[PDB]
Nucleic acid binder design. Structure first.
Ligand SMILES: OC[C@H]1O[C@@H](n2cnc3c(NCCCc4ccccc4)ncnc32)[C@H](O)[C@@H]1O
Ligand SMILES: [K+]
Ligand SMILES: [K+]
Length: 546
DNA sequence: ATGGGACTTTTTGA
DNA sequence: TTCAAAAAGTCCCA
């Protein structure tokens, strides 16, 4: 339903927009929260406004109607002309209306600008000086399909495919912000790097000046909520400089109440600060300090190939109901399944650097079951146990897929070959050579080398550089940060990784072969692997001139 | 009970 | 026909 923003963040966002407002020049500022809820932001806006008017009451009295500008009239003026809110939930609006009314503690029917409505559909009849708040976050699975049709038709500039509802709130906030106005919101951080956020990033960069980005990375800002947050402050002021302040957290384990204010935390050693030229932003926003930019640019300039140039990428199997098709390799039910139907099956946790654990699970590649009479035992006793849920998959409702078939069985011959596999979400680079024809779900991605690039790049060389500390840091510069100690390792970024080939190729490959050989023996002395990795990292840093 | 850690399905638009 | 993206993740315990 409704999510509670921490008070320290609310106060920071309100101060960000109002701390330098010239109330003498403009005593009628319009401040709007478009998903105000119970008024976490708007009630704080009231307090800031009240002090602002009271500190300058005599100056306003002298400059303007001296009967209008009294301390006793500040409450009425704020509610009539300054505070605006919208929310879909009428109970929240009712509570906020009482809270705003009780700030005074009837005289005559004071009107409060609170709208119970869908903020994305409301005919907004004027623009606003300042916009603050915390919009709803709803992804592609959890957003109602009927509503998505409206968003795709009307918010197509920021919303396509797997985009999120809060993209549209960025759009609406920008569109109804007054010229010279200031907006400050807390949203998920994912749009900063995600493929879905590309159009939204283009919309922001070309319509507002981004003053500041506070990136909390994987820190837990909302207690008991699995989301990662950032704060964006932007304006429509005519400026020539357009440089962004970026505050990036250093330690994700920090608790947000370290000081009384967020400014103390931002200026502390817990955060790093650097500046980014908004004019230099491409479709991607590479937000790193100068040392990392130099590091990243050296590697990009030195590497003449990308993984996409040399490799074929694919996502793993999607059965659509794992419990129906995935069995423990020691399950007695597998005696019913001819081994021609059985594939080795691994999870993301089975991928280490350079090699995969031995599989403990088997997939029934049910697409190869010819019909329901020749293998009735498998259908009745294993797969049919989940027949109702299997029939509710989209391709079964439409008749594209039989009820016992895998939803997305892919191509078997893609998996039954030497290939490289990596987990879809990890704390570090973990690229392994698969020797055992392992299948996997979508928590593991795979690629193999194009035949015309085999004489330039071997699998052993590739897992060598890809698992190095250099490439771990290099990938994480632009990688999508998901939660604490987790990055997405998806092809839309993994395949952009650039690779090189030079005089160190042979020794890097040989070091990788030694690592693999040690990792695969029984009396495993894991320690020497670390020494070999350090030597390989030195060769790689020498190659890339870092 | 909360807060922190290990781990990751299938729905969905294109 | 069939690809790949998506954390207001999910679930557990001390
Ligand atoms: O969570 C943050 C706050 O945000 C409010 N809020 C959500 N969503 C809209 C909204 N429009 C989008 C509607 C999306 C939708 C479509 C179908 C069914 C259910 C939701 N407009 C104004 N406040 C909103 C919530 O009430 C809450 O207080
Ligand atoms: K006057
Ligand atoms: K988080």
């Amino acid at each position: 339903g409704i999510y509670y923003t921490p008070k320290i963040i609310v106060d920071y966002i309100v101060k960000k927009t109002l701390k330098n407002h010239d109330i003498i020049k403009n005593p009628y500022p319009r401040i709007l929260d478009i998903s105000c809820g119970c008024g976490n932001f708007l009630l704080e806006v009231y307090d800031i406004l009240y002090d602002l008017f009271e500190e300058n009451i005599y100056e306003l009295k002298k400059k303007y109607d001296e009967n209008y500008w009294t301390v006793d009239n500040i409450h009425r003026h704020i509610l009539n002309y300054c505070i605006y809110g919208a929310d879909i939930d009428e109970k929240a609006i009712s509570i906020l209306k009482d809270s705003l009314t009780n700030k005074k503690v009837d005289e005559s029917d004071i009107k409060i600008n609170l709208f119970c409505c869908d903020s994305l559909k409301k005919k907004w009849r004027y623009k606003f000086d300042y916009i603050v708040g915390n919009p709803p976050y709803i992804g592609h699975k959890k957003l109602e399909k009927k509503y998505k049709k409206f968003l795709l038709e009307k918010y197509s500039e920021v919303y396509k495919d797997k985009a999120d509802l809060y993209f549209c709130f960025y759009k609406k906030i920008i569109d109804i912000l007054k010229q010279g106005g200031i907006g400050s919101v807390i949203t998920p951080r994912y749009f900063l790097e995600s493929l879905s956020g590309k159009d939204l990033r283009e919309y922001i960069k070309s319509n507002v000046n981004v003053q500041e980005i506070v990136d909390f990375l994987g820190a837990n800002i909302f207690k008991n909520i699995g989301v990662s947050s950032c704060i964006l402050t932007f304006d429509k002021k005519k400026t020539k400089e357009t440089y962004i302040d970026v505050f990036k957290i250093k330690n994700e384990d920090i608790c947000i109440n370290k000081f009384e204010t967020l400014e103390e935390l931002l200026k502390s050693s817990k955060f790093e600060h650097f500046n980014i030229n908004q004019r230099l932003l491409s479709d991607e926003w590479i937000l790193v300090n100068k040392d990392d930019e130099t590091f990243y640019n050296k590697i990009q300039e030195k590497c003449k190939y990308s993984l996409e140039d040399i490799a074929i990428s694919f996502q793993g199997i999607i059965t659509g109901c794992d419990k129906a098709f995935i069995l423990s390799k020691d399950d007695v039910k597998l005696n019913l399944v001819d081994d021609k139907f059985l594939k080795c099956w691994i999870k993301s946790k089975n991928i280490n650097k350079y090699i995969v654990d031995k599989s403990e699970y088997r997939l029934i590649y049910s697409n190869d079951i010819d019909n329901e009479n020749t293998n009735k035992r498998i259908l009745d006793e294993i797969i049919g146990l989940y027949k109702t849920k299997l029939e509710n998959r989209r391709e079964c409702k439409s008749g594209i897929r039989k009820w016992y078939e895998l939803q997305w069985g892919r191509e078997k011959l893609f998996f039954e070959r030497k290939k490289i596999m990596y987990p879809y979400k990890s704390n570090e680079n973990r690229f392994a050579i698969d020797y055992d024809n392992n299948f996997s779900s979508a928590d593991v991605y795979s690629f193999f080398i194009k035949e015309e690039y085999l004489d330039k790049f071997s699998y052993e060389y590739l897992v060598g550089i890809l698992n190095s500390s250099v490439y771990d840091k290099y990938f994480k510069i632009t990688a999508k940060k998901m939660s604490k100690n987790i990055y997405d390792y998806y092809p839309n970024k993994v395949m952009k990784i650039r690779i090189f080939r030079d005089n160190n190729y042979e020794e890097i490959e040989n070091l990788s072969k030694q690592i693999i050989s040690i990792l695969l023996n029984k009396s495993i002395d894991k320690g020497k692997v670390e020494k070999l990795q350090i030597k390989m990292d030195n060769l790689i840093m020498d190659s890339l001139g870092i």
